[PDB]
């Protein structure tokens, strides 16, 4: 009780995924996200890759939308949300497609493997652990 982030059980490792955005698809992703408040208190992780259910399998549980949130994060969900673009096009490295190909998205995926807190959105971080939690 009595805190700025006001939250129980604080994580540590912040796994942020990239899904196109602006200039620095990677930077603009989190870099820009954290470009909000201050930076510190926690360690921010900026990585660009496809939110495969393989690894998301963990978040898929600790989330109502789980993968849907991911597939829904990218454009043409119904496509990737199924087997479309989702194919070996976005699978491995979706950044190769999100990089600007297929579509030029601008969503930030924030997933916590410390507290098991995930949320497809850049605000999910600020809400949970902003640029400095």
Q: Verify whether residue 30 is a known catalytic residue.
A: no
CA dihedral 122, 125, 128, 130 (to 10 degrees): -120
Check: CB of residue 5 under 8 Å from CB of residue 129: yes
> Pick the catalytic residue: 97, 98, 111, 118?
97
State the Cα–Cα distance between residues 66 and 85, nearest whole angstrom: 19
The alpha carbon of 19 is separated from its chain's Cα centroid by a whole number of angstroms, namely 8
Q: Are 68 and 81 contacting, i.e. CB atoms less than 8 angstroms apart? A: yes
The residues assigned a catalytic role are: 97
């Amino acid at each position: 009780m009595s805190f700025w982030k006001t939250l129980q059980r604080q994580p540590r490792t912040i796994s942020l995924f990239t899904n196109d955005i602006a200039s620095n698809i990677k930077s603009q992703k989190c870099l820009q996200l954290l470009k909000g408040d201050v930076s510190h208190r926690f360690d921010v992780e900026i990585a660009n890759r496809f939110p495969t259910w393989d690894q998301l399998q963990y978040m898929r549980t600790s989330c109502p939308q789980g993968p849907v949130s991911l597939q829904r994060q990218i454009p043409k969900l119904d496509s990737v949300l199924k087997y479309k673009h989702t194919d070996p096009t976005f699978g491995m490295d979706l950044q190769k497609c999100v990089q600007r190909g297929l579509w030029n998205p601008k969503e930030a995926l924030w997933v916590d493997w410390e507290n098991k807190l995930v949320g497809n959105e850049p605000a999910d971080i600020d809400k949970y652990i902003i640029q400095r939690k």
